[PDB]
Design a protein around this nucleic acid. Structure first.
Ligand SMILES: [Mg+2]
Ligand SMILES: [Mg+2]
Ligand SMILES: [Mg+2]
Ligand SMILES: [Mg+2]
Ligand SMILES: [Mg+2]
Ligand SMILES: [Mg+2]
Ligand SMILES: [Mg+2]
Ligand SMILES: [Mg+2]
Ligand SMILES: [Mg+2]
Ligand SMILES: [Mg+2]
Ligand SMILES: [Mg+2]
Ligand SMILES: [Mg+2]
Ligand SMILES: [Mg+2]
Ligand SMILES: [Mg+2]
Ligand SMILES: [Mg+2]
Ligand SMILES: [Mg+2]
Ligand SMILES: [Mg+2]
Ligand SMILES: [Mg+2]
Ligand SMILES: [Mg+2]
Ligand SMILES: [Mg+2]
Ligand SMILES: [Mg+2]
Ligand SMILES: [Mg+2]
Ligand SMILES: [Mg+2]
Ligand SMILES: [Mg+2]
Ligand SMILES: [Mg+2]
Ligand SMILES: [Mg+2]
Ligand SMILES: [Mg+2]
Ligand SMILES: [Mg+2]
Ligand SMILES: [Mg+2]
Ligand SMILES: [Mg+2]
Ligand SMILES: [Mg+2]
Ligand SMILES: [Mg+2]
Ligand SMILES: [Mg+2]
Ligand SMILES: [Mg+2]
Ligand SMILES: [Mg+2]
Ligand SMILES: [Mg+2]
Ligand SMILES: [Mg+2]
Ligand SMILES: [Mg+2]
Ligand SMILES: [Mg+2]
Ligand SMILES: [Mg+2]
Lengths: 394, 15, 97, 153
RNA sequence: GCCUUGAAGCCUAGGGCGCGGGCCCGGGUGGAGCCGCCGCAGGUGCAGAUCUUGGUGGUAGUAGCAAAUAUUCAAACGAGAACUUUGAAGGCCGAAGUGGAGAAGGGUUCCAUGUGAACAGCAGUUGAACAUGGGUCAGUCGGUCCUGAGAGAUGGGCGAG
RNA sequence: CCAUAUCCGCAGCAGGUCUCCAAGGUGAACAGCCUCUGGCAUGUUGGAACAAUGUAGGUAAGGGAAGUCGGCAAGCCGGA
RNA sequence: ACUAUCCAGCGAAACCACAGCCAAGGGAACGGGCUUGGCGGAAUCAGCGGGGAAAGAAGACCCUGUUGAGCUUGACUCUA
RNA sequence: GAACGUGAGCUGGGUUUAGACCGUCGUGAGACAGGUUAGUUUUACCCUACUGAUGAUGUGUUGUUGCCAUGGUAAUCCUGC
C-alpha cells in the first residue's frame, strides 16, 4: 500500500559514498578551457586557512532597500606566501583520454620539497635527484634535455607546471611542502614552454594570478566528526519516547519482496572529512605582508582609506589555534570548508560572470580586530591603555 | 530446557 | 608474615577493638613468637604494643551557637518547622500556671 | 614416550616434552607456528617482547572475533594479540631442552627449532548457573607439547 | 584340517575374482584359539522411527565476568605479589546500622601447625578447602513438674475382620 | 554461625527467615544529611581510550498540549 | 556517570539435510539449487535489522473421531 | 501499489481468553452477529544483503605526481515594482 501523506527525501544521492577521503590536499577535477587569444596566465594557487572576522562596507545596489547604506558581513582569511616553480610536465591527447608524455625537473630543489619524498627524513641519506642534477652541469645533458623540449613543442597539447610552497615562513609545526600541478592557459604550446622555461626555479606571487572583485572556486577537505548515526548524518525524525529498543533510529528500511537493502536507505557510519567543491566566492581584498624598508610596516594589511589607524589584520592574542600572519593574504566573502591550518586550493571560475551581484565593486570602511578568545571589546592595545589607565605595572 | 513463553500467551493467535 | 592472631589477643587484654591497636612495624620478629598470652603482656610493658587514643570529637561549635540562642538569635520566622504546640504546648503552659 | 616424526640424525638433536598443561590450546598452537624455524637465542628475545607488548603473534586460523593491530604487518597480516601465558610455558620448556643438549655435548649456539607439535587433551569439568533453574558446563581445554631441536647453522 | 616357526580382531596409494550380495591373497600391529563340507536350530543382516545409551564438532577464543560512591605510598615473609600482613593517608556503614548478643535450623563448620594437586566461574604466599591434632565442667541457667486448646486407654457398645 | 558466605531456595544466588540493647549536631521527630564507639575494603577480576545505539540522571532561546486513543511521563505548588 | 569497544586471565548456550549474489520463465500456481540471460576475486572488524515463508511449543480457532471430562435439566436406566 | 509494504521497527486504542455490569432470548447451565469497564507483546553473537573500515592479484622492490573505464547525480516554485 502507498504512503499516506507525501514528503521529500533526506539527503542527496549525488554525494553517496560518504566515506572518508584518501587525501589531505584538494585535487582539481577540471580546469578551465583555453582560448588561444589570451595572454599566458595561470589558473590556480595554494593557500592555507587562518581564521574569520567581519567587515563593514557601503552598498550601491540600485533598486534595493539597502542601497546607499552600510552592511555588516563575515569573511575568511587565507594566508598565501608566494609559491615556487620546480618542474614541467607535458601531456598528449589519445582516444583513451590523456597520457603523461614527458616531464622535466630543475637543477636545484630545496629540502622542504624533498621532504615530500622520504617518509623518514631522519635516518635517510637524502640521495634524491643527485644523479639527475648532474646532467645540468654537463655537455650531453644540455644536448639530452634540449632534445626533449623540442618533442613537447611537437607532440603535446597541454602543459602543466609543478610548484610547491614555502613552509619555513609559517608558524606551524610542519616542514614538508605541498606539490601541485597547475595548468598554463594561453596562446600556443611554444609560448608556454618559453614562458615557463624562463620562469623555472623562480617565485610566483598571488597578484600575478588573481585580482580584486573576482569569483573563484575553493576546494578542500571538510572537518571530521567520526562515526555517527542517522539522525546526524542524514537528519531524520527522532522517534517518540515510548520506544523500547531505542529512539534515534529509522524504523523501516524496505519492504518484503525487493528482499535486499537498497543504497537509498539511511545508515550509520562516517561523517565529515570529505572532499567538496564550492563556487562563486568573492575576493574583497589582497593584503601585503610584513616588510622592512628601514623599520617595520604593518599598517596596510588592515588600514582602509578612512580609519587610518596603524593596525594590522592580526587580532589581539593572535589567531586562535593558528598563529601570527606575517605574509600576504586574501579575504573571501562568507565561509569555507575545513578546519584551521588546513590547505586550500583557489581556482578561477569556469563560467562567464554577468550578474550584477558578481560584476559590482567594493570599497571597505572598517575591519574588526577584536580578540576572539573571549568577548573582545578593544581594537588595539593603545586604546585599551588610554581608557583604563596605569595598572600595578608601575 | 529453555523457556520461550508463558503458556497463557500462545504467540500464534488467529481467531 | 602473619599477625592477625596477635592483633586479636591484644584487643581482649586492653578491652579495645582492633582499630585502636598499635604494633611496631619494625619489631615484627619479636611479635610473631607471641603465640599465647603472657608472651604478650610482657610486650605491652616493654612498649612495642600500644593502645591508640580516641579520635577527637569537639563541642565548642555547639556550645558557642547555643550561647547565642540563649540571647535570642537563630530563632526567627524562617527557622521554624513545627507548629507552636509542638515547640511549646498549651497544656504544659496551663499546668505551670 | 614415542614421538611423532622421529628425527633424521639422533646424535645432533635433542628433545623435550610436556603433558597435561593448563593453557588454552588455541592461542598456544598459533604461538608455535610463529616460533618455528628460528634460532633459539632469537626466539627468547621474541617471547620476552610478547610479554612486554613490543611484538606479536598473528591469529590466522583461530581468528573469529579477534582484533586488528599494527605489528602484524611484519608477518603480512592484520590481526594479532599478546598471549603472555603461553609464552612463559614455552620458555620453561626451551630450558629443559637446552640443558639436555649441553648434557649430550652439543654446540649450543647453533641450534634450530625444527619440529613443534601441539595436541589437545582431557577436559576438566565445572559448572555455571543460569536462569530458570538450568545448569551448563564450564569446561576447560588444556594441551600437550613435544618438540625437537637440531644443530644446524 | 590350521595354529606360539604365531589364532581371533583391526589398519592398508598393494594384487585379484564375481552382474551383485560378498570373498581370496600380500604387508604392519597383536598375543591364544579358529575354520571348510552334509544335515539341525534360531533373541539372525539398519540410514532414518521430535528412536534409546555414550562420545564429539561448527558455533567460538565468541556472548559474557557492569545493582548498592573508592583507592594510594612504602616495608616484611617469599622461587614468585593489582588481591596476604604491618604501618601511614584518604573514605563508607551512621545506633529501626554493614555494630554486640540469642531462638528455629545446621552439625565440628570452632582453635593451632603445616600444604598449595583439586575447589574458591581472574589470581592467591590466603581460605568456611586438604591433612594432623585439640576443644563444650552447674544443688541456684534451661529440661524434668503443672495444666491449656485438645489427643487418648479401661468398663460398655458396634463391627465379616 | 544466626545471614548481601555456616538456614531454605540445585550454588558463597540483589530473594525470603522470630527477638533484645540503642549516643553528638540540625529539626516537631526512631524522617532524611554529616560525625564518635565498634566494623569494612565496594560486593564472583583489573588496565587503556572516550565512537555509534543504550540504562539512570540533568538543562534548554521564543511559543505553550498545536503532539497523542488519552497532558502517558516529566515539571509547578510544597514547612511555619 | 555504568556499559558496549581494545588488551591480559577464565570462558558457555540455543540452533545446524547441504549450503548461502539477482531478474524473468515454467512448477504442488510467491525457488539459495532447475532453464534462458545478468555476472563471478583471499582472510576479516564495528553496526543495523530487508530475507533466510529464521528459533520455540506434534495449531487452544474450524472439522472429523461410533475418544473424554466439568456443569444443567422435562433426556434414558438406577440409588442414599 | 510493493504478502490488502513494513510488530526480533514502535504502540496495543479496537477486535479475539480468564473477572465483572445492563437489555433481549433460554425453565436452566448459558448465548447475542447488542452496548461498557480492567487486562505479561520473547531471542541476533549465525549466512546473506546494506553502510562504513583494513587488506588482497600482478607490475623486480619502494615512493611522488597523475589519466580514465564504470557507476551514481539536483535544484524547484511564488510574489512584488
Ligand atoms: Mg502519494
Ligand atoms: Mg513499551
Ligand atoms: Mg572565539
Ligand atoms: Mg548465572
Ligand atoms: Mg533457583
Ligand atoms: Mg594369555
Ligand atoms: Mg541365540
Ligand atoms: Mg531382532
Ligand atoms: Mg545407526
Ligand atoms: Mg530406510
Ligand atoms: Mg569480548
Ligand atoms: Mg557489579
Ligand atoms: Mg557478635
Ligand atoms: Mg550481628
Ligand atoms: Mg539460633
Ligand atoms: Mg579460580
Ligand atoms: Mg577459622
Ligand atoms: Mg548516606
Ligand atoms: Mg574490587
Ligand atoms: Mg558476596
Ligand atoms: Mg523553551
Ligand atoms: Mg489534538
Ligand atoms: Mg494529529
Ligand atoms: Mg502523572
Ligand atoms: Mg562485541
Ligand atoms: Mg528470483
Ligand atoms: Mg508465476
Ligand atoms: Mg531455501
Ligand atoms: Mg531479518
Ligand atoms: Mg496437530
Ligand atoms: Mg494438539
Ligand atoms: Mg462413522
Ligand atoms: Mg476427572
Ligand atoms: Mg424424567
Ligand atoms: Mg499487511
Ligand atoms: Mg513482537
Ligand atoms: Mg519483520
Ligand atoms: Mg485493549
Ligand atoms: Mg472477559
Ligand atoms: Mg557517466
Amino acid at each position: 500500500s502507498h504512503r499516506k501523506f507525501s514528503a521529500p527525501r533526506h539527503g542527496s544521492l549525488g554525494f553517496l559514498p560518504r566515506k572518508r577521503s584518501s587525501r589531505h590536499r584538494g585535487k582539481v577535477k577540471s580546469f578551465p578551457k583555453d582560448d588561444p587569444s589570451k595572454p599566458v596566465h595561470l589558473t590556480a594557487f595554494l593557500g592555507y586557512k587562518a581564521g574569520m572576522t567581519h567587515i563593514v562596507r557601503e552598498v550601491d545596489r540600485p533598486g534595493s532597500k539597502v542601497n546607499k547604506k552600510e552592511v555588516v558581513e563575515a569573511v575568511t582569511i587565507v594566508e598565501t606566501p608566494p609559491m615556487v616553480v620546480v618542474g614541467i610536465v607535458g601531456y598528449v591527447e589519445t582516444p583513451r583520454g590523456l597520457r603523461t608524455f614527458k616531464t622535466v625537473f630543475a637543477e636545484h630543489i630545496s629540502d622542504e620539497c624533498k621532504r615530500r619524498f622520504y617518509k623518514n627524513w631522519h635516518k635517510s641519506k637524502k640521495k634524491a635527484f643527485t644523479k639527475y642534477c648532474k646532467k645540468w652541469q654537463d655537455d650531453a645533458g644540455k644536448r639530452q634535455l634540449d632534445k626533449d623540449f623540442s618533442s613537447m613543442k611537437k607532440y603535446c597539447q597541454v602543459i602543466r607546471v609543478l610548484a610547491h610552497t614555502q613552509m619555513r615562513l609559517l608558524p606551524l609545526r610542519q616542514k614538508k611542502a605541498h606539490l601541485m600541478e597547475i595548468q598554463v592557459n594561453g596562446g600556443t604550446v611554444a609560448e608556454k614552454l618559453d614562458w615557463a622555461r624562463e620562469r623555472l626555479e623562480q617565485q610566483v606571487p598571488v597578484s600575478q594570478v588573481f585580482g580584486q572583485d573576482e569569483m573563484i572556486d575553493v576546494i578542500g577537505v571538510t572537518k571530521g566528526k567520526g562515526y555517527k548515526g542517522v539522525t546526524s548524518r542524514w537528519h531524520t525524525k527522532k522517534l517518540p519516547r515510548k520506544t523500547h529498543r531505542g529512539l534515534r533510529k529509522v524504523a523501516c528500511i524496505g519492504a518484503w519482496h525487493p528482499a535486499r537493502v537498497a543504497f537509498s536507505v539511511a545508515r550509520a557510519g562516517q561523517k565529515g572529512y570529505h572532499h567538496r567543491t564550492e563556487i562563486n566566492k568573492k575576493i574583497y581584498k589582497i593584503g601585503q605582508g610584513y616588510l622592512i624598508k628601514d623599520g617595520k610596516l604593518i599598517k596596510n594589511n588592515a588600514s582602509t582609506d578612512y580609519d587610518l589607524s596603524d593596525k594590522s589584520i592580526n587580532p589581539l592574542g593572535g589567531f586562535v589555534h593558528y598563529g601570527e600572519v606575517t605574509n600576504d593574504f586574501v579575504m573571501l566573502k562568507g565561509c569555507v570548508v575545513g578546519t584551521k591550518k588546513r590547505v586550500l586550493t583557489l581556482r578561477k571560475s569556469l563560467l562567464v560572470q554577468t550578474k550584477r551581484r558578481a560584476l559590482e565593486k567594493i570599497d571597505l570602511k572598517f575591519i574588526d580586530t577584536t580578540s576572539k578568545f573571549g568577548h573582545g571589546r578593544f581594537q588595539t592595545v593603545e586604546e585599551k591603555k588610554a581608557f583604563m589607565g596605569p595598572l600595578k605595572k608601575d | 530446557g529453555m523457556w520461550r513463553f508463558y503458556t497463557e500467551d500462545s504467540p500464534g493467535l488467529k481467531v | 608474615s602473619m599477625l592477625r592472631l596477635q592483633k586479636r589477643l591484644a584487643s581482649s587484654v586492653l578491652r579495645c577493638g582492633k582499630k585502636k591497636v598499635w604494633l611496631d612495624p619494625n619489631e615484627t620478629n619479636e611479635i610473631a613468637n607471641a603465640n599465647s598470652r603472657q608472651q604478650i603482656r610482657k610486650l605491652i610493658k616493654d612498649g612495642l604494643i600500644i593502645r591508640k587514643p580516641v579520635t577527637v570529637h569537639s563541642r565548642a561549635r555547639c556550645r558557642k551557637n547555643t550561647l547565642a540562642r540563649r540571647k535570642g538569635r537563630h530563632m526567627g520566622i524562617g527557622k521554624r518547622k513545627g507548629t507552636a504546640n509542638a515547640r511549646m504546648p498549651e497544656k504544659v503552659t496551663w499546668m505551670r500556671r | 614416550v614415542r614421538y611423532s616424526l622421529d628425527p633424521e640424525n639422533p646424535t645432533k638433536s635433542c628433545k623435550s616434552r610436556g603433558s597435561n598443561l593448563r593453557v588454552h590450546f588455541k592461542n598456544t598452537r598459533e604461538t608455535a607456528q610463529a616460533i618455528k624455524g628460528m634460532h633459539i637465542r632469537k626466539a627468547t628475545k621474541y617471547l620476552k617482547d610478547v610479554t612486554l607488548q613490543k611484538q606479536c603473534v598473528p591469529f590466522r586460523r583461530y581468528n573469529g572475533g579477534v582484533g586488528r593491530c599494527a605489528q602484524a604487518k611484519q608477518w603480512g597480516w592484520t590481526q594479532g594479540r599478546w598471549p603472555k601465558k603461553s609464552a612463559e610455558f614455552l620458555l620453561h620448556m626451551l630450558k629443559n631442552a637446552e640443558s639436555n643438549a649441553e648434557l649430550k655435548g652439543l654446540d649450543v649456539d647453533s641450534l634450530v627449532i625444527e619440529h613443534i607439535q601441539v595436541n589437545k587433551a582431557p577436559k576438566m569439568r565445572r559448572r555455571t548457573y543460569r536462569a530458570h533453574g538450568r545448569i551448563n558446563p564450564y569446561m576447560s581445554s588444556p594441551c600437550h607439547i613435544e618438540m625437537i631441536l637440531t644443530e644446524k647453522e
